[PDB]
Design a protein around this ligand. Structure first.
Ligand SMILES: NC(=O)C1=CN([C@@H]2O[C@H](COP(=O)(O)OP(=O)(O)OC[C@H]3O[C@@H](n4cnc5c(N)ncnc54)[C@H](O)[C@@H]3O)[C@@H](O)[C@H]2O)C=CC1
Ligand SMILES: NC(=O)C1=CN([C@@H]2O[C@H](COP(=O)(O)OP(=O)(O)OC[C@H]3O[C@@H](n4cnc5c(N)ncnc54)[C@H](O)[C@@H]3O)[C@@H](O)[C@H]2O)C=CC1
Ligand SMILES: NC(=O)C1=CN([C@@H]2O[C@H](COP(=O)(O)OP(=O)(O)OC[C@H]3O[C@@H](n4cnc5c(N)ncnc54)[C@H](O)[C@@H]3O)[C@@H](O)[C@H]2O)C=CC1
Ligand SMILES: NC(=O)C1=CN([C@@H]2O[C@H](COP(=O)(O)OP(=O)(O)OC[C@H]3O[C@@H](n4cnc5c(N)ncnc54)[C@H](O)[C@@H]3O)[C@@H](O)[C@H]2O)C=CC1
Ligand SMILES: NS(=O)(=O)c1ccc(Cc2c(-c3ccc(F)c(F)c3)nn(-c3nc(C(=O)O)cs3)c2O)cc1
Ligand SMILES: NS(=O)(=O)c1ccc(Cc2c(-c3ccc(F)c(F)c3)nn(-c3nc(C(=O)O)cs3)c2O)cc1
Ligand SMILES: NS(=O)(=O)c1ccc(Cc2c(-c3ccc(F)c(F)c3)nn(-c3nc(C(=O)O)cs3)c2O)cc1
Lengths: 331, 323, 331, 328
């Protein structure tokens, strides 16, 4: 008898699948922020990591494993081979090229589509019943791409979308009003990018319409220049990229928020990238953010947000910009 | 009236934060400490300091953008230490990662008096390496009592040990007990007599535990505590996540006055035949006043000699330092 | 010599003040549900319990202490003497007497005044700078009573008010819509319980006003009978009391949420009872629920909700009734 | 045309982490709130035979849903509400009656289990059963026999609470958080439990080695009183408030955490111990067990003194003797 044998009597040796497995693909700044945020929210019983850079992948995995004492996720694995990802409930894709200073997210398309052509079939092979959560940019276009390549029903292909833009908007609104963002309500929809749409008509604190109180809210005639709040949301990534090189923490928290709703079947509403065909007269298979009910089967329902004529025109412009790109892609 | 005044009636107009933490140095380690402390709801105000102003602002903004998802309502930063005023706990992660030691000492000469100016009754938690030496340097420069100067020390080494023990036994690390003491890193000491599951001494069950003759080579578990760190540095360039979690665990005990026991670096002159002013890790009771008490572990002759060799080594270096 | 001294070397014996202390006065079902909820949210470093029933008090304290391994609140104390409450940041009052069959509201309030004349000066002696959170019913009147006796400024005397009523409303809204209550917004204001006011204009999902979509919402013309949601906010409480004898779990959760905002200085908005003289054409020193910003100094600000004529008349009628009782009280 | 359909466009018309609590007295409801506040389940079902109390408890929890992350709370007297539970916690018990014998009370609780357990098995044939109801070691045996489950799937709370109390009391003597005070109470829950003095330690420092009289009658510091206070403090709580609830509920939630999250942490829980310590009969006693998604997968073989082994053997003899007298 070995020490382990003398210490421990085994009742059964059976391999059971994990109950709540999450995979993150891409262990860069974003993937590792999503990983740590998910670990510290106790959302998974197994975390798997995938990348193409083998040394970085192993190092990241080890660094998280060394923290196991402080976590409640008892198995952390990694590998370049997608067999490590099998039986995942949720697969989060963060791999690919990121924006350089002054580059648009839309300049990343070719690079990141060609990565997805390899990643997505491999994910689907090993977790045919997972939900896919796309983070890689440009996130709305890549959500469309992941949906086309996977063959999944569209409820199971979810882009992180404007959950982050809306969190930024609420932070900025809170700063102006002296209220925690949790109590400042306001939605940013459409592209996660330059063409996003602030929904001024829905902004409120305690159910009190700010546009009703201040009819010029968001317009050029506004003495308080609330449009600058949305301009700051749009410019956020560019400033943070200029200062620190990339963004990571806010998106990691945003993704963990989405993962919480999916994994715990909460049926919370989040603005995430999905197919908008049938809303606002849009006929095209365009993906962009609208508020969606999220839970264990992904997106089960879309909220039909009432938009002003100007808000609706701006959303349709965002859809046109994205569809212009999405329609020319080759599969 | 502004929209704000139309919406909101003000009852009350100066607040002192009540549970504030500062992190100095927003590199990989300082930001891992920051996110971990944020996600554990330990502070009502988090301040960040660095000398690289753009990096600092960018890190601050990135955290602020996640405020909706957190319960820490104020995140601030600056190169000026006024931003750190009234911190309960100041965590120093600034550095490079004998000339190199002196360069981190040179950074401490600027950092420590600035911290003390703005938070004279904080607890100082030193993470920067070489951590046992820099904890001594921070103690000397600050003039703080020994209870309020704590090195992260072997808390991380012990967490690695417990992970690796758990992997061998098929038990979660929480239920695998074992202590790594002394110097952080290469010269640490695994206390084999204390390694246990459910109070069952593994050394009593398997008396060759830890020795050269052990058929199962349990000494490799300690070798891997040392070597797995260097492996992570080779593979990814640095370590960050585990130290960040370790630090947040220490912060939790201090902020919440838990009186949990952790192997952190403390001024140990007067124990184990140690006769110089050096900091080594021993199990310490941590709470709101820092280290209030420590556990006197019974050590073998060999273990005591290893701590004494470490103290001689540390002291050798410290007597050469200029500050 | 002792085993303790052989094992542990003491560095300093300095006497410590707790930094984040909470007291609960009254350890009936409601006080204990508050206690457990606060304990399981890691809001306090010390929890003190007070009651007049000495055996019950000690037994509750001990039972909680036996669970210490599972908690992160290192000191739990109790006693009939208020010295155990010293230096509390937050003092929660759940003590009082329950209405008897055939007892007038004035008589019942006067009995609770008498009990508060015992409790409140002793709280103030030991925690002169605490925030007081009054849960005891009738809560809006007893918040006024606590304010008068304590001598505290308005910002530091808070009634739990309609925070529970609103949480019930959001549950019931969520059940009808198939959406988590976190994503169902709506506010019940005014008097806790029977006379509360559902603010239909603020009821929304994702900023979309239900009343705008369905103008008959809340009226007798409504074929979907949404008024029944508010009827059930009132009646479901009576129903729980009929079925189990009292209510406890929900109020405990709601109080812990208030305590979280106060203890962490969040500046979240909650519908709690505050002195409302000077709003809505109210002229008397009465306390009613409006959305208030809660943080480390208690209520720092309040939201001025736009009310319909009927809603405003209901608040004024409540103010009249409450003042009519208050003017007859003997302090 | 309905408001719901004007607001929401539907794309799609079982729970994955469901827990049931059977018996909604103070213990059951303390287990429930603790499990809810730890986000361990996506669905919680409650069962009792007292229909009004059951419905009221359910409603009161539902009213707190805004503050929780468990989106479905259900109840009923019919076990269809318990279907597809991962973990079923039994906190049901008979009310003590003035003048009844101990053996009579045990048999009445056995009769309750005869109704409950087959109903649990019908609707969640693949669950883990966690038995809290007293006498816990006997009733865990009973549930194992009636259910026909393999032993890894029938777990008694056992000495889990006793050990928590012990660590609390040790922490109070030493001025250290109970998290950092280690020590195990094994065997039977309650009066006949066994304090394992050899395992008592802080930071891996054996208190027995420092203080060889520890736990004996010779001991000037009377550390034996720490163990006596474990059961005496329990009975004191019952005298004072009428029952115990919060510590049990927290300790049960900790067990549920290890099982639901597959943690493989070690807890002293009651398990079928025949074949250890020279025990020859089908009895359940508490030893340190590794808990995860398959229940008890492994257990720790604590080295005991001759005197400690003889205590466990005497407990086994006692339990088997009672189990023969029970009808089920
Ligand atoms: N949706 C959103 O709100 C946000 C999206 N992003 C996007 O996230 C993505 C990742 O950004 P970072 O993590 O900062 O970049 P990074 O450069 O730090 O990491 C990217 C990782 O992807 C890996 N990768 C590349 N090809 C791969 C393949 N075929 N399979 C597996 N892994 C592969 C790389 O080896 C690298 O480790 C970018 O597209 C970025 O624009 C970034 C921030 C916010
Ligand atoms: N004790 C432990 O167990 C561990 C300690 N460490 C140590 O943590 C330290 C930091 O490591 P990394 O974050 O990877 O290094 P890094 O190079 O990423 O970051 C160090 C930061 O310190 C800043 N800094 C430099 N001089 C400063 C000053 N005068 N004031 C304020 N900030 C200043 C730098 O600008 C930089 O942003 C190193 O000394 C490293 O060895 C790392 C891992 C484990
Ligand atoms: N605001 C709200 O939304 C809600 C308020 N409540 C109210 O909470 C209060 C407590 O309800 P329960 O716990 O069910 O009642 P309870 O009658 O069980 O408990 C009251 C406790 O107060 C104690 N007490 C009486 N006089 C005292 C004194 N002078 N000092 C200290 N303690 C004293 C009693 O001994 C008793 O233990 C009631 O007034 C009830 O209506 C209940 C639910 C919701
Ligand atoms: N293992 C441990 O360490 C501990 C165990 N306990 C035990 O927990 C149990 C419950 O304690 P309390 O809640 O105080 O008792 P209680 O008597 O208040 O509650 C028992 C509940 O079981 C229900 N019940 C009875 N027959 C039933 C049936 N056929 N189906 C469904 N439910 C039924 C009752 O109607 C009642 O609501 C007791 O056996 C007690 O000894 C308590 C503390 C510690
Ligand atoms: N007992 S002592 O204070 O004299 C001492 C402590 C530590 C070391 C070696 C050492 C250094 C180091 C870095 C910069 C220096 F200027 C220096 F002198 C040393 N970093 N480091 C790391 N540890 C990790 C990890 O995750 O464990 C990541 S880096 C490590 O193990 C030697 C002596
Ligand atoms: N605006 S006011 O201060 O005048 C006021 C407040 C409350 C009530 C009705 C009322 C009372 C009550 C108790 C004793 C009395 F003497 C009395 F007049 C009323 N308890 N209670 C409860 N609510 C629950 C729950 O879970 O919601 C459990 S009990 C409730 O809704 C009326 C007036
Ligand atoms: N090894 S064994 O299964 O035969 C066994 C177990 C338990 C007891 C004594 C016993 C009983 C009990 C209750 C009903 C009975 F029919 C019965 F036989 C015993 N409840 N109880 C409690 N413990 C607490 C607490 O908070 O610890 C609250 S109640 C306790 O300590 C004896 C033998």
């Amino acid at each position: 008898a070995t020490l382990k044998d003398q210490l421990i009597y085994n009742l059964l040796k059976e391999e059971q699948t994990p109950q709540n497995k999450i995979t993150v693909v891409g262990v860069g700044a974003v993937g590792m922020a999503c990983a740590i945020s998910i670990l510290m929210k106790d959302l998974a019983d197994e975390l798997a990591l995938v990348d193409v850079i083998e040394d970085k992948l192993k190092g990241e995995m080890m660094d998280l494993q060394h923290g196991s004492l402080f976590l409640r996720t008892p198995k952390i694995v990694s590998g370049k081979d997608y067999n490590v990802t099998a039986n995942s409930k949720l697969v989060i894709i963060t791999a690919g090229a990121r924006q350089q200073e002054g580059e648009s997210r839309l300049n990343l398309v070719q690079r990141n589509v060609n990565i997805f052509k390899f990643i997505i079939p491999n994910v689907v092979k090993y977790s045919p019943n997972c939900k896919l959560l796309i983070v890689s940019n440009p996130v709305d276009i890549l959500t469309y791409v992941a949906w086309k390549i996977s063959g999944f029903p569209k409820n199971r292909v979810i882009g992180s979308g404007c959950n982050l833009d809306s969190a930024r908007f609420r932070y900025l609104m809170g700063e102006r009003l002296g209220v925690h963002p949790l109590s400042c309500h306001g939605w940013v929809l459409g592209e996660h990018g330059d063409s996003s749409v602030p929904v001024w008509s829905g902004m409120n604190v305690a159910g009190v319409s700010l546009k009703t109180l201040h009819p010029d809210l968001g317009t050029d005639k506004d003495k308080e220049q609330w449009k600058e709040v949305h301009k700051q949301v749009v410019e956020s990534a560019y400033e943070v990229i200029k200062l620190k090189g990339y963004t990571s923490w806010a998106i990691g928290l945003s993704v963990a928020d989405l993962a919480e709703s999916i994994m715990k079947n909460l049926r919370r509403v989040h603005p995430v990238s999905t197919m908008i065909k049938g809303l606002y007269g849009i006929k095209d298979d365009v993906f962009l953010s609208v508020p969606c009910i999220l839970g264990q089967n992904g997106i089960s329902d879309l909220v039909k947000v009432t938009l002003t004529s100007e808000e609706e025109a701006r959303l349709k412009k965002s859809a046109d910009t994205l569809w212009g790109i999405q329609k020319e892609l080759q599969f």
